[PDB]
Every structure is written in C-alpha cells, then in structure tokens.
Amino acid sequence: DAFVGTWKLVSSENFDDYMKELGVGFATRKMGGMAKPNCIISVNGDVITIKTESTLKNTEISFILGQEFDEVTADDRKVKSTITLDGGVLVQVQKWDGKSTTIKRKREDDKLVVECVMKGVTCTRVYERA
Ligand SMILES: CCCCCCCCCCCCCC(=O)O
Ligand SMILES: Nc1cc2ccccc2cn1
C-alpha cells in the first residue's frame, strides 16, 4: 500500500534512550545505534511481512492485522505483539512482563516514519525508498 517497498534508514533520533528504556545492554546498544537497516514490507492477502536486514542482525515478522502473535525481537525479548491499522498508521504494540512498547509506522510524503515509545522516551526513525 503506502507501506510496501524496500526502505533504508536515513535518520534516527533518541534510539539509544529508547533501547536503554527497553533494558538493552551497552554492547547491544552500541551495535544497534549505528546500524542503518533496510526494512522490506510486503503484503500477500491477509498477511503482512516486515523484514529488517542489517549487517549484524536480521529479523522478520509475518502477521495478520488484529491477531496477536509471539515475536522474538532484535534484542531477544519474547513478546506478544499485535498490529492494527489506525487512520493509515500501522500501530504495533509489544507486551512482555507487564510492560509495553508501541511502534507506529506511517507514510509521510516520500518517507516511512517510525515512532517508538517506551515509558517517557520517544524515538523517531525515518526511512527512504532504496
Ligand atoms: C543486535 C542488535 C539489536 C538492535 C536493538 C534493537 C532493539 C529493538 C527496537 C527495534 C525498534 C524498531 C524500529 C524500526 O523499525 O526502525
Ligand atoms: N533486525 C533488526 C536489526 C536492527 C538493527 C539496528 C536497529 C534496529 C534493528 C531492528 N531489527
């Protein structure tokens, strides 16, 4: 849709603070902070696939909107995730150990804008088409 494509990270704000709030350790934050991943988003009927590829870590999720699934995150959290579409925004929530984080993906002009929130921390990541 608006989301389908191969996207390359071009900017990131507050990602270290966001990772710290998730409980990610220093060595992993160091690797994560200067990664510039690609994000490849595809859709095949009810099923959306989001692949994130980087030099030191690949991940992939496939889901149906509104159907909770188990996810192992890039930082090795075991979470229950639910993704819905709200006013053209893909809203992902991850829940684990009584905690939650939201990752909102929106299309704005030319860009894919990803807002990640944990507690008081808001991180914004922008991707452009590859
Ligand atoms: C092994 C390096 C792992 C890097 C740490 C990743 C922490 C998980 C937060 C991922 C948020 C996704 C936001 C995005 O798609 O740009
Ligand atoms: N697979 C994967 C790799 C990442 C590398 C850096 C930052 C975030 C990331 C998210 N997912």
From Swiss-Prot:
Subcellular localization(s) per the UniProt record: Cytoplasm; Nucleus
Modified residues (Phosphoserine): S11
InterPro entries the UniProt entry points to: Calycin, Fatty_acid-bd, ILBP, Lipocln_cytosolic_FA-bd_dom
Superkingdom of origin organism: Eukaryota
Phosphotyrosine modified-residue sites: Y18
Principal location listed in the UniProt entry: cytoplasm
Reported impact of E21D: In a breast cancer sample; somatic mutation
Keywords (A to Z) from UniProt: Acetylation, Cytoplasm, Lipid-binding, Nucleus, Phosphoprotein, Transport
Motif window: Nuclear localization signal: 20-30
Pfam families: Lipocalin
GO molecular function (one): hormone receptor binding
Amino acids binding a fatty acid: R125, V126, Y127
Cellular component per GO, a single term: cytoplasm
Entry comment, domain topic: Forms a beta-barrel structure that accommodates hydrophobic ligands in its interior.
Quaternary structure and partners: Monomer. Homodimer. Interacts with PPARG.
PANTHER family per the UniProt record, alphabetical: FATTY ACID BINDING PROTEIN
Record-given protein name: Fatty acid-binding protein, adipocyte
Native species: Homo sapiens
Lineage: Eukaryota, Metazoa, Chordata, Craniata, Vertebrata
Gene name as annotated: FABP4
